[PDB]
Amino acid sequence: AHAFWSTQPVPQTEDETEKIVFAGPMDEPKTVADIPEEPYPIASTFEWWTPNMEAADDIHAIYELLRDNYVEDDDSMFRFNYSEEFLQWALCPPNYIPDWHVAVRRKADKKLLAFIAGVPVTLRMGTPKYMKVKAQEKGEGEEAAKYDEPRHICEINFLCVHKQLREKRLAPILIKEATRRVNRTNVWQAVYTAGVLLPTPYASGQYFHRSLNPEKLVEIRFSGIPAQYQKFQNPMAMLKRNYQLPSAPKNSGLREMKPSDVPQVRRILMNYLDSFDVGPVFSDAEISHYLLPRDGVVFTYVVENDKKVTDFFSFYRIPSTVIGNSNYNLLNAAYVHYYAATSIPLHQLILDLLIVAHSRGFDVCNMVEILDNRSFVEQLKFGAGDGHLRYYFYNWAYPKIKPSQVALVML
Ligand SMILES: CCCCCCCCCCCCCC(=O)SCCNC(=O)CCNC(=O)[C@H](O)C(C)(C)COP(=O)(O)OP(=O)(O)OC[C@H]1O[C@@H](n2cnc3c(N)ncnc32)[C@H](O)[C@@H]1OP(=O)(O)O
Ligand SMILES: O=C1CS[C@@H](c2ccccn2)N1c1cccc(Cl)c1
């Protein structure tokens, strides 16, 4: 039963999202003027805080709250350790709204106890092409297309409540207050993902992992040593051999992206993402922000031939704290970010991603089965991991789609 989510304009059952065919809002139309100008009441001991994302110490404070209290695996062996530079990058894209970053502090000592972040995204989120066609066949195209235009909405990430404060109903309050701030900005939809099942996802996809340093991975117990490896003389030598990668990329004219590549990367990205039902639209400034290489944060390479960019890939780094273990502090994971291929099969392009990642010291490469990510799983030796990433809209009815129809990558 859901005391909070039942009060919210989201689909309430799996049933509701099977019956849905057109995109559009769920709630009553409202106006900025309908929305309370004052922050949601919270207890006397606490206060609403808007971190300054240009302040190293506000960034640090958020960093600490996530380092100690953010998402762990089911066995409390690992916890994400997003870096400060990653958080400045993710929290401050072009035209970000400082007010959408919502925090609760203890008034006495200014200890950060809870956080959620919103950032702008321009999202295509109209009726999927299929439902759009089924709609003509039944005479209802204008209705199916009403919301085809890309929409400036809020993307929510980094909801975190201090472990000492869990199950005190603080997360509802953070969400109501984020919602109020976003609504005051005249934005009525949001997009979010979670590893947990909430009401009600529009898409769900498994995670996949590709071992790059399997000895470390087994050592920290991220990976097992499969049963067929027993019947073998020296387990690890077989495993390392199985996962070994070339030292240098195979595509000649792969190089790191540079500022002048922005317009071309934009165009082959937009062309590719445009084929999916749900996907972001980026300006040049968003392309530079999200894809220009940044040290220990995002890593992007283009294939250029005859002075033209014809393919590119990117990945970002999130290290995970290894929670038990005396020998290892961190596990260094690369996450497949946006890419586009026009001159070579995707599997050949993403082999270079794995090669570069391995070459720079990453232990595993991770992704969700969105985009055409299923297309290279077998050949590059990715295996399905635990659990699923679920995709959600706030205040947006949307039919249930497959993850291969989603082109929004979450940080
Ligand atoms: C238009 C603008 C809209 C803007 C907002 C759009 C929506 C944004 C929504 C947020 C998108 C987040 C995207 C990400 O960042 S997903 C990552 C979420 N973060 C973590 O998992 C970090 C570790 N966990 C924690 O920090 C806490 O356990 C959290 C904060 C997750 C819950 O704190 P706590 O454990 O102390 O519980 P409570 O007593 O305060 O509250 C219990 C209520 O909270 C509902 N709950 C539990 N987990 C989640 C979850 N991941 N999303 C949404 N709701 C969740 C739960 O069903 C229950 O409601 P109800 O079942 O009683 O009805
Ligand atoms: O990349 C890593 C490093 S260890 C593990 C993990 C799980 C939960 C929280 C942090 N890290 N992990 C992982 C596993 C499954 C999904 C995701 Cl997004 C990350």
Residue numbers in the entry: 11 to 421
Task: Please quote the authors directly.
Simultaneous replacement of the R1 3-phenol-4-methoxy groups of 1 with a 2-pyridyl unit, and truncation of the R2 benzyl group to a directly linked phenyl, resulted in compound 7 and an unexpected inversion of the binding mode from that observed for 6, giving rise to binding mode T2. Compounds that adopted binding mode T2 show the R1 2-pyridyl subunit forming a hydrogen bonding interaction with the side chain of Ser330, and the thiazolidinone carbonyl group forming a hydrogen bonding interaction with the side chain of Asn376. The X-ray crystal structure also revealed the R2 substituent to be located in the hydrophobic peptide binding groove, lying in a similar plane to the aryl group in the pyrazole sulfonamide series. In binding mode T2, and in contrast to 6, the S enantiomer was bound in the active site. It is unclear why compound 7 displayed selectivity for TbNMT over hNMT. However, this observed selectivity was lost upon removal of the (R2-phenyl)-3-chloro substituent, seen with 9, although this is partly due to the overall diminished potency observed for this compound. Substitution at the ortho or meta positions of the R2 phenyl group appeared to be preferred over para substitution which may be due to a clash of this substituent with the side chain of Tyr217. Interestingly, the thiazolidinone compounds displayed two distinct binding modes with different enantiomers bound.
The enzyme N-myristoyltransferase (NMT) is one of only a few genetically and chemically validated drug targets in kinetoplastids, with the NMT inhibitor DDD85646 being shown to act on target and to cure the mouse model of stage-1 (non-CNS) T. brucei infection. Functionally the NMT enzyme is ubiquitous and is responsible for catalysing the co-translational transfer of myristate from myristoyl-CoA to the N-terminal glycine residue of the target protein. Work was initially carried out without X-ray co-crystal structures; when this structural information was established using the Leishmania major enzyme, key early-stage molecules were also co-crystallised with the enzyme. As we discussed in a previous publication, the L. major NMT shows high sequence homology to both the T. brucei and human NMTs. Compounds around two different cores, thiazolidinones and benzomorpholinones, were validated as hits for TbNMT.
